[PDB]
Design a protein around this ligand. Structure first.
Ligand SMILES: OCCCn1nnc2c(Br)c(Br)c(Br)c(Br)c21
Ligand SMILES: NCCc1ccc(Cl)c(Cl)c1
Ligand SMILES: NCCc1ccc(Cl)c(Cl)c1
Ligand SMILES: [Cl-]
Ligand SMILES: [Cl-]
Ligand code: NA
Ligand code: NA
Length: 328
């Protein structure tokens, strides 16, 4: 009874228990021998990712081989991906497979030809940013409507094929089901994309965490400061936020939710006014900034997770009118 989501709060309760009870999920594990690994694409604490070919039909795919130890987390990611099947701009899980001898599991995803935006021919326009942000919001509205928080929204988890104009939200390994009043682990998201709720150890968070991360991406793309809030560690991350949003405003948020603040913060927060968003504009980013971009940003990068726009409200904002008009 501390906080709950403004949208989609009871949606899992209204579904069959099997929908959200991922520990009870029994995946159907197909045969990894149908896939030929071509090249390594990346590696994380829990997985490694390869480009591959399905030798039975010549399809190019991505294979994520899972370090098999933590079976509950595997079931969680599999069930979430199955629940999100067909969702707009969510990476498509094609199959769940195992090495038939070792039984190590892997996930097979659709291929996306991921653009490196550091190495571009013409770099992003105002319309490009509006377009891709709208496409990303479609994925977040979809997963939130499906009762799921992504909890790791960041540029590297948003694949964009800038030639075909295709966007996919990937890496659902940290995603969870939202249940009202549930207390969640705050050790989620990338440092630069962690919401203030995580940084102050507030466990009763919801889908609005992803909307903070989204806002951080919007700020970095319109202002060209990437990442926008560049903490040196989790403590400094909150200081970077407070230098923009203000310290008195932080304390008002903490008071509202009765949040205890780790006293190490007292020695590092200092005192900071809330800054005007227009302060971030200069000649190198002016062409990407508009009154409507700043109004949207202001409504996403708020301490109070409850008062941030939902993904749908964000999609409805005038910033996206040119996108909706072109899409019609
Ligand atoms: O869902 C976790 C996925 C991990 N992961 N890491 N790098 C990826 C790239 Br490049 C592409 Br293309 C795709 Br498709 C996926 Br899938 C990738
Ligand atoms: N968290 C997954 C990050 C990741 C790893 C590899 C690739 Cl190729 C991409 Cl796009 C993104
Ligand atoms: N890896 C692509 C990250 C990215 C870049 C630009 C935009 Cl506008 C978005 Cl939504 C996402
Ligand atoms: Cl959790
Ligand atoms: Cl700053
Ligand atoms: Na898809
Ligand atoms: Na802390």
């Amino acid at each position: 009874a501390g906080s709950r989501a403004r949208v989609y709060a009871e949606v899992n309760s209204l579904r069959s228990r099997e929908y959200w009870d991922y520990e009870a999920h029994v995946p159907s594990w197909g045969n990894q021998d149908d896939y030929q690994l071509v090249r390594k694409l990346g590696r994380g604490k829990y997985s490694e990712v390869f480009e591959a070919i399905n030798i039975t039909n010549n399809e190019r795919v991505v294979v994520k081989i899972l370090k098999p130890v933590k079976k509950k987390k595997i079931k969680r990611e599999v069930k979430i991906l199955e629940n999100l099947r067909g969702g707009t701009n969510i990476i498509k899980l094609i199959d769940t497979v195992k090495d038939p001898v070792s039984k190590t599991p892997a996930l097979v995803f659709e291929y996306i030809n991921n653009t490196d935006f550091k190495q571009l021919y013409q770099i992003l326009t105002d319309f490009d940013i509006r377009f891709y942000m709208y496409e990303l919001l479609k994925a977040l509205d979809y997963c939130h409507s499906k009762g799921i928080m992504h909890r790791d929204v960041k540029p590297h988890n948003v694949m964009i094929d800038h030639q075909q104009k295709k966007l996919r939200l990937i890496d659902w390994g940290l995603a969870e089901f939202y249940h009202p009043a549930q207390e969640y682990n705050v050790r989620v998201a990338s440092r630069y994309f962690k919401g203030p709720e995580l940084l102050v150890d507030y466990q009763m968070y919801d889908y609005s965490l992803d909307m903070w991360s989204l806002g951080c991406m919007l700020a970095s793309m319109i202002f060209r400061r990437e990442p926008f809030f560049h903490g040196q560690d989790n403590y400094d991350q909150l200081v970077r936020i407070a230098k923009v949003l203000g310290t008195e405003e932080l304390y008002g948020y903490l008071k509202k939710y009765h949040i205890d603040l780790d006293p190490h913060f007292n020695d590092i927060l200092g005192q900071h006014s809330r800054k005007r968003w227009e302060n971030f504009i200069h000649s190198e980013n002016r062409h990407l900034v508009s009154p409507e971009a700043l109004d949207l940003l202001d409504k996403l990068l708020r301490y109070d997770h409850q008062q941030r726009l939902t993904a749908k409200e964000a999609m409805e904002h005038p910033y996206f009118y040119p996108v909706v008009k072109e899409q019609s």
